[PDB]
Amino acid sequence: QNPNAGLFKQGYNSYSNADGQIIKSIAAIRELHQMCLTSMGPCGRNKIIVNHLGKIIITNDAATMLRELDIVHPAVKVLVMATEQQKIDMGDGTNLVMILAGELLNVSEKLISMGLSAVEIIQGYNMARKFTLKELDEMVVGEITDKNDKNELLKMIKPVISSKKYGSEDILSELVSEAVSHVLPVAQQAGEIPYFNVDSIRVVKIMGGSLSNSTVIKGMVFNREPEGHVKSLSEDKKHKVAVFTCPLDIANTETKGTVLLHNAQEMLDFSKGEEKQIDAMMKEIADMGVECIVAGAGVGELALHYLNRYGILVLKVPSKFELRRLCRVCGATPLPRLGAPTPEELGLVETVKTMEIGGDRVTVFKQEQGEISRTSTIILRGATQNNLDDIERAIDDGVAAVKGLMKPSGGKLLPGAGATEIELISRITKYGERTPGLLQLAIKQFAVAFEVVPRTLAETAGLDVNEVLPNLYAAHNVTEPGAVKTDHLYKGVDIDGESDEGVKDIREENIYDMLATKKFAINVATEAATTVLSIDQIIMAKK
Amino acid sequence: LLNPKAESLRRDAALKVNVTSAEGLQSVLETNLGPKGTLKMLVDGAGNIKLTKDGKVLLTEMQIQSPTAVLIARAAAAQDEITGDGTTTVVCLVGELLRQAHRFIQEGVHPRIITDGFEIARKESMKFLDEFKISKTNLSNDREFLLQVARSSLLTKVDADLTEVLTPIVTDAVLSVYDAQADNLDLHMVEIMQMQHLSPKDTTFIKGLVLDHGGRHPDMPTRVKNAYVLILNVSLEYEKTEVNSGFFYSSADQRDKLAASERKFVDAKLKKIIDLKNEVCGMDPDKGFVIINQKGIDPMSLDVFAKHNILALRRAKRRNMERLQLVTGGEAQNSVEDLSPQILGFSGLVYQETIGEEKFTYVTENTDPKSCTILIKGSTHYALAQTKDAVRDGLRAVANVLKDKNIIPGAGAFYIALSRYLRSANMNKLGAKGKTKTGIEAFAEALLVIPKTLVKNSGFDPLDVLAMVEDELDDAQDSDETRYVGVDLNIGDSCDPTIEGIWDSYRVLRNAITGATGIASNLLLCDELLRAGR
Amino acid sequence: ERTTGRQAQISNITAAKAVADVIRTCLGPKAMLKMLLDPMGGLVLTNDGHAILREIDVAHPAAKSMLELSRTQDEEVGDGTTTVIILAGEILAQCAPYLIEKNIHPVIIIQALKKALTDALEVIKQVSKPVDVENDAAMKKLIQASIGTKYVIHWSEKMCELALDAVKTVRKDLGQTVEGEPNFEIDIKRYVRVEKIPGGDVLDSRVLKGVLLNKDVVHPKMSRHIENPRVVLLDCPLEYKKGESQTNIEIEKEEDWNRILQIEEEQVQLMCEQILAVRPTLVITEKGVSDLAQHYLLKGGCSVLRRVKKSDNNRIARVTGATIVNRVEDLKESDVGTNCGLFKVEMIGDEYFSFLDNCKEPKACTIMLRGGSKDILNEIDRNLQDAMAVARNVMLSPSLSPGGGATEMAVSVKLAEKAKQLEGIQQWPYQAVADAMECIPRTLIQNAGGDPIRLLSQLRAKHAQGNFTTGIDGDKGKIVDMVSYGIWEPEVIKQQSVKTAIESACLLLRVDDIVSGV
Known part of the structure; x- marks a missing residue:
């Protein structure tokens, strides 16, 4: 009895911004944004997914979950493709890209509610992306000298394994370093000529024993x-x-x-x-x-x-x-x-x-x-299949990350555990305040979008965010008796778990992130967010 | 007055249906106008997500239920074979003109008077376009104007950031593919390639051709300079019978005797090939040698070529072979028996590109290729499709501008000036009729839709920027000098399109106006809908 | 299913009115468009009345009868189908109140319709204007009326020239007192059949006195151009001779097969010699020609042509004098190459043709239609057919009636004046017909966009006082004199339209019951 007016395309699924689809797409993406928010951080957790063959899949990798999950909404497909690109090009940082894109869309929802046109939001996001990419060059603290030694390799290996297999990073990093050392050639300080390949190391597992019984084959x-x-x-x-x-x-x-x-x-x-x-x-x-x-x-x-x-x-x-x-x-x-x-x-x-x-x-x-072989094999031992699978995934991620230590920002190190994120938040906030026009709101929201990483780390570790977040802000925003900041400016986000106050310095545990990984992840996340936000209507034809 | 089991529409129902369909299509395509427009996602049941802003793609790949909307979309898309752009402009003009016509009809104006007024206003707009165009200089050194045109055509399809990379590539390709002579322009000599390895920002301009099928050998040359091109049509690989067969041996002597039959022809051809290679560039320094070998090549001959520092390709496409002949100047040798040095061509830097899933060979740097190639890069299907559409649109726009020296300044100046001229001329002359003034005003108001939509898509209020542009137009007309006034979609204030660098194609605007007027006249003359044939 | 009595009459009238309502906007140059919904989802915005009638489906049998009558009119006359349907529907509608409410028997209404038809024919005759068929300019102007809004509007001058030339060429006065004296006996279909030649411009079309053939030489090495051709017409094929029934050669021995081949060769040679006995230059055979026959004919210095149907051989006999004989052995020596201008096979549009043009008019001609594409050729052919139909109507009936609805208004006014003297119950349907006649000017006014009420009254008053010399302009929409504007149409069209409309009304009224059965 109710008349239908304004519809002329088809009775098939169709969405337009006239009904607020610009926010409905963000809400739909939030369904998997919440799923992926539980994976990032050293205290990340796996999830149980049933395969089409009736098998049980348990993994801490968000990309694997997305692959094993059904994607319907095109907006979610955009983020899935962005995550696939991140994994293929870099080999790590899928959680970073997914979470950053989700938070960018979430803040874009607030911007739309405020009444800001999507065009201005996109322009401000692009400006903030350029500013952040330029700033990341000055945020480098350490650098990998490419000595190919196990001690230097561990510096990058250890953080990569973390957030993939919690509690076993010490042994997995040693195993990865031993496997890599068997295949690396005799060379140092050479980032332009590739030497290490992702397929150079094979990973196998044998039931029985524990991870402490694992070894490496030449x-x-x-x-x-x-x-x-x-x-x-x-x-x-x-x-x-x-x-x-x-x-x-x-x-x-x-x-x-x-x-x-x-x-x-x-x-x-x-x-x-x-x-x-x-x-x-x-x-x-x-x-x-x-x-x-x-x-x-x-x-x-x-x-x-x-x-x-x-x-x-x-x-x-x-x-x-x-x-x-x-x-x-x-x-x-x-x-x-x-x-x-x-x-x-x-x-x-x-x-x-x-x-x-x-x-x-x-x-x-x-x-x-x-005829010295250029390949090595890693043998994993353990009585639990889920733990063996998680360890295999962590080893694969570490091997992929090791290949990324080449010249293009491979050796450059950034302070991890959210310290870089807080510094970027402060810098982008200052830039937005300096930036005139409506772009300031978009720059400020882009800065706020980076607050997720410390929030995720605090939540996954069981810490109270209401106390950690202000403590982190105070630690990264300090007043010193001089014109140049000094003291401990590299404080990160600690997980503690037994007893502690505040947070620990990065240099205490040497938790560093690759500059190239973070930069490419930010770029891909911003591109995906812009692509999703740029869609104000979806028209499809019935099959 | 109806037959049993029949369906028909009478009274104003036809007008309501047509107006509703036109307004729906206008609203659908409104957000795709201007560089600040939105992107639409299309899924033709396959589940693949495709993003685009081109009117033709949006209309053709989207299902339309309303029959009037189907005809409007078909008519708008038909302009692609005439001008290649303006589909969204045509749709918006048709929608707004139909809305104004319906508004006037509600006051009692008969459709025929509206159609007559539309025809009169169309003639007046053609006169205005004739008096308003600017004759572009034919000097071949006007790279700045070509870059401005390419940027104007591209910004509508890209995110305003890839422009800095794509605009120069397209402009240079179109400028180079046109010979330094009257002749004519032909974009068929400009090839477009798609690669899924790198990001869209890594796209670059290729001076020559790229070959996909090549040989494989660890010692194969990687970079060759000042290379001679030899095209061969005879197979250089072992061949077997149609039915599965092979050579079986029980001793080394039998092995050699049986392999002799396979390798005899290959060795015979290689003898003369190596003799030719030694004759030309055998000892000459700073020279190379590249052989196409359209037919297949066996690994033994590939190794033989590699040991002689010869870049050997195999299984080349016939189209690529013809393009090489037209570019490198080399001829195709039917059989090595008549191999001669005159067959050899010449080319510049020849090198191979290694990709994880494939390999490519570059034969660029030719003396007079008379052709161009554009490489499109991306990580997703939708990005590659958008880049391809943008590149094709830019190529066609630049080619049309080169062919037709007439250029219409953009930035919304054309439509506002046309509306003002129409209003003033029809109020002064009063030469059509008193009642036809209704249709004249309808056309004048409808022609302002494009600037209004462009302003709306940019987030600014049309009521203010259009008023400012009108004031500036009045000031310029009062002044004795000639000035063009438009809308700055980035700042929000008025600007001069001839200074900023925003231009519109003369043919696109002319054909869009003609098509919109025709579609509106045809639709407004529909009184009843009759169903028959089943 | 089944209906009878007053209900059946009402249903028939409603069906007629519904059919008429379809094409109310298909009248005059200002005809509006209609939306035709295709069952597959398509839409056609054609404004042509006959196309809509042929494409619009109807359920009521009376509507089907009206559609059949419109189709018949489309062949009887080249225009007025929409007028016929509209007039019939309006006449039926106006008689509805008298048929039903007044309880008037159908017989009385039919008699009144016949009387009104006679009176309307008389009135149309009265308001006719003579035409001088010898005035080329007047004929061209009249023909231009049907060329309006046509693809060949730009070349209307050449279109009219070609139409007049073709019509005059095929004219047959046939003066006599046995079967009457027709004016010109013009027949486009038979005497002016148009051949479509790809390529060329609209103005490149010419009227050729001869026969055009689409078949080229049968062998690459054979004479193609002949200045003084001598044509031989035959139907029997040149091959192995067979009996009057099915013949099958089943031989397993090579010697007998060779004997059969020798017999075939001898028979073909004899037939070719018989053909060549008349020293011909071209052989045209309707049936297939064997390779042996082609070689034998070529060796004699005579070209060979095959696969030419009798429809072409009969015309070739007229422009070459050749005698068509079914059997080769019966060929005579009467074949001549006289009355033939050339055998040029000039190629037009990458297609080879054969021309037998001469300098005489054998009461027939062929138009060498040219155009840039097949669609253009068809459009130009239809436009030329319309122009020649108009010319035929003018010449056969050198009389014109005023256009723009003036004739209808005059008929209505005179019928209203005469109805007062009827002195009978029939006066009611008579006045109904008189009023229905006024629909055409009302439709023209509505299409133009003026006042449908006041303008009609002004037209009636002017016709009453203006000697029926006023009408409605297609563009202005006001009441104007037809003489100054030169809006005229053939009288035959109006007479046929009125006759058919009134006959259709009588036929539909005569049926008072519809029953099912087979």
Whole structure:
């Protein structure tokens, strides 16, 4: 009975600012903003998400939660894409980008309520972004000299692991540093030539024990049974290793070549052919000095018997990625054919052995003197699968962060635990006060948006924000007997948890953040906030 | 008066429906006018989010239920093949003109008189446009005016920050692609590329072409200077039969004998290829050699080329081959048997770009490429689409301006001046009719929609800035000098478009006015709606 | 389902009024647009009355009858369909009060309608004006009336020239006392069929005295231009001779197949020799021509053309004198190349044609229509058809009636004057028809945008005192004299419109019951 006027596009979902959609989008984004607010900070917490396969997923990474959660509203999709960009380009700071964008939208809601046009809000946000990016250059306190030493690497590794696995940062940082040191080349003070790759370090886990029992391997590790009578090779140096893709069996043509034994004549003929061909191929391979053969497919009975006869290590690697890693480690080239031990294609591995870790035996291909491997493997031990998964995620994040120590602000260090955030708040507030026109309100709101980080740290640690926030403001806003600020200007946000007053200085625990990470996160968050705010109407067509 | 089981609309219902649809479309597209406009998100059921401000994209990719709105959108979008811009202007003009016509009809004015007044006002506006245009200089060194035009066309589609990067690229591409001769302009020689690796702010101008298919070898040259271009159409890779087949051996001798059949032709071609490479640039310093090899290349020949410091590409596109021939000047060799040094071309710096998911080869720095390439970069699909749309719009606008020396100053001066001239001329001449004055005033008021929408999108009140602009126009007309008065969407006060650098296309405005007048006249003449055909 | 009696009459009248209401705005140059809602969501804003009538669907059978009558009028006359429908609907509406409230039997109403039709025809004859068919300028001006608001409005001069040339060329006075003496017996469809040639401008169209063929030579190496062509017309194909029924050759031996091939070659050679016995230069065969026949004809220095239907061969016989024979063996020597100007095959619009133009008019002609696109060709063809229809109406009926509704006002006034002397119950439907005749000027006034009430009364008064020489201007909308403004239309159009409208009204009134069954 109620007439409908003003609608002409379609009865499908459609939103316009005439009904306040500019605030409805922000409210919708808040649903996942609250979700991600509980992840940032050293005292972050994971969440339980059920996969489509009926499995249970528990992780502290907000990006993983977003991936495992259904995204419907385009406004949320914008932030999801921004977070994906942050993860791909930088490898860390997804929580920073998400929370900053959410807070920027929240303050934009207040600005809209005040009556400020979205155009002025966007202009002020852009100006504040430029000011903050320029100021971050002067906020640097320390810097990584790129000595590639474990002690210097830990300085950056430790903060990265924190907020991903709380309480175990000390051991995880040592493990990451040990793994990185095995692959870094002999070089120092060189940020223009890449040396470290994210894939250079592999992470594996073995059930049983605790994190304290974890170790690091100086080469490739295979977690599959060799399926043969040869378990390990001697300690002789420079073992020749042959890599094959065709299964170790009778060699046949590319087309057809199937062997079928139907009757006595065919049985005898095919048995003789298979035995002779396999024996000849194995003898030829052994004569070249090949002590280990790795095949991407299975191994036949006669193949196993002849491999045992010549004492050739037996191993199958159905995973092509593992084959590529082995080839990179030893330099061997995959052989599509059988019985072709070409020296130019055979690799060299100094030591090949089977090692038992926690009751599980694995095969390790490591280099000692020659053909030094550029890859390392991390083995995690623990009786809890959730803890192992969290540790694996933390190790991956640390490995990704380590790759970011290059010239473009990789080594530059900022005071973490919100100290940089408070300094930026003060500077942006001063700039907005200096900035004339309506842009001052937007600059002040952009500054206020940065107050979340200390608030999140205080809340996740169980501290009373009503006391921590004024204490932080006083600590970062002090009056000294002179024209230049002095004393402890690097006070951060402490978690305590047992007993403490105020906050602790950053230098006490050396909690520093990468300049490049923070700068790129701020840029991406501001871009996402501007993109979301710039949409005042959504029109879609029914499928 | 109706047949059983029939649907029809009589009385003023048709007028109400048409006015409602026009107002709805006008409100939908109002916020997309001017550099301060908003962005709309479109999802065509696939769930992909696309952001754009172009009127054609908004109208064509959005579902419209009202039949009148469908026709209005189609008519507005049809201008893309005539001028390439002004769709939103056409829609806003149609909406406001229909609103004014309905307002006058409520007073008893017949639609036919309104249509006649619209025609008279259209003729007067054409005369005003003729008397108001400025003849742009044809000097090829006017890079400043081209940059101003590109900035004006781009600011409507970008966030006002990527302008500083995109404007120079588009302006330089359009200036270079036009030969130093009368001839004509053809944007088909300007290629646009999209890459998902870097941010949109990293976009740059490419002087030549980029090749996607290349060889792979650790020793392949990375940078080549003063390189000769050789295009070859004969395969340089091992080939097998259509049915799966291969060579099987049981000994080294059999291996070599069977591989001889595969490698014979490759070695025969490589012999003459290397002979040619030695003949030209074999010992000449500060020179390079690049071979296209449109056909595929096997790893053995790639290694052979690498050991000879030859940048070898494979599986090149036919279109890219033709563009190389037109750019580098090299010819395509059907068979190496007739290989000769005359086939060799010449090119400047040749280098490869390595990306995580792909690789590219640059053949830029040619003596006379007679072509340009623009590389678009981004991290998201919507950003890339917006950048592509903006680049295409800027290219078309600059090309049209170069083709047509007539330029109309922007900043809202044109519409305000047109309205004032229409009002004054029709009040003085009184040559159409007393009642037609209703339609004349309707057209005059409707033509002010564009500046009002531009002011509204910028957050300023039209009632003040438009009044100030009117006062400045009166002062200028009283003065003996010629001056253009517009609206500054950034400061809020009045400004001179000819000094700030805001311009509008003559053809865009002319065609937009004509289309808006035609659509309004056609729609106002609809009296009843009849349903038939099912 | 079923309706009878007064309810059936009311339903029929309502259906007629609904049909009339569709095209009330489709009259005059100021005709307004109508919204046609497509079931697929489309919309067409066409203001053409006949298109709307053909596209608007109706349910009541009377509406279907009216649509069929309008379609028939579209063929009988080139204009007045909307006038016919509007007049019929208004006549039916005006007779409704007398039919229902006054309990007047349909027979009396039908008789009154017939008498009113006779009187209206007499009045239309009275207010007619003679036309001098020998005045080219007057004919061009009259033809320009239907060229208004047409794609060829700019080339109206050349359009009128071509239309007049084509009409005069195909004129057939047929003076005699057996079947009467027609004026010109003009038939565009048969004597002025238009051939569409891609390419060229509007003004490039010409009237050619000859036959145009769209088929080119059958072999790349063959004569293409002949100054003095000699055409041979035949229908039987040149191939292996077969019987009068189905023939199938099923041979498994190569020798017999070779014998059959030799027989086919001999038969084709004999047929080609028979054709060439008359020393021809062009062979036109309706059916297919085998490659052997083409080679044999070419070796004789004679071109070959195939796949030409009888519709073209019959005309070719008129402009070349060739005799069409079904069978090759029956070909005669009467074939001549006389009365043929050329065989030029000039290419127009990247399409090859063949021209047989001459310097004589065999009571027929073909218009070489040219244009930039097929749509332009169709538009120009329709405009030329309209112009030639107007010319035919003027020449066959050299009489004009005043336009702008003046004729309708005069008819209404004279009918009102005469009704007083009827002295019978029939006077009521007579006055109803007289009043309904006034709808056309009312519609014109409404479309123009003036006062629909006072202007009509002024028109009536002026017609009463102005000798029926006043009307409504399309633009000004005031009462003006038609003589000064030159607003005239053919008398035949008005006569046919009135006849059809009154006949439709009588037909719809005569039906008082509708029943179902099959």
